[PDB]
């Protein structure tokens, strides 16, 4: 039971950590990307993050 709980917790934590990865983009937060870049390039970055 402890192993199952730990696996679920680490899977959720891994998902949350992966949520904050650049994936080859300028930044890991889309607000900063929108504030910095232009419509087309920011759209490309958002598509890669997506």
């Amino acid at each position: 039971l402890q192993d199952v709980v730990n696996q679920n917790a680490q899977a959720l934590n891994t998902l949350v950590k992966q949520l904050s990865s650049n994936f080859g983009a300028i930044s890991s937060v889309l607000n900063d990307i929108l504030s910095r870049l232009d419509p087309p390039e920011a759209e490309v970055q958002i598509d890669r993050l997506i």
Binding site: D38, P39, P40, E43
Partner: protein, 98 residues
Amino acid sequence: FVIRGDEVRQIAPGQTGKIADYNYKLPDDFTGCVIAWNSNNLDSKVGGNYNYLYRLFRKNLKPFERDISTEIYQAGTPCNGVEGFNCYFPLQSYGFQP
């Protein structure tokens, strides 16, 4: 329409610029194209050709709009529709010369 040399790059979808934001807007999903040809023998005259005008001051345009109104632009004491401080003319001419 008629534009200048460096204005060609601004006539394109997704390209930023003063003219590309206040005069003519191309949609992000634009389908079509642009044919530009030099008219130095027709639109240019000795002494300066000033028939062609472009908006200079504006608060943004969505794709494919026409803004024929050129009401005076307020930059922030308001001048109340009179040329003076904190407000300048919204249109500017090109002044093409040979």
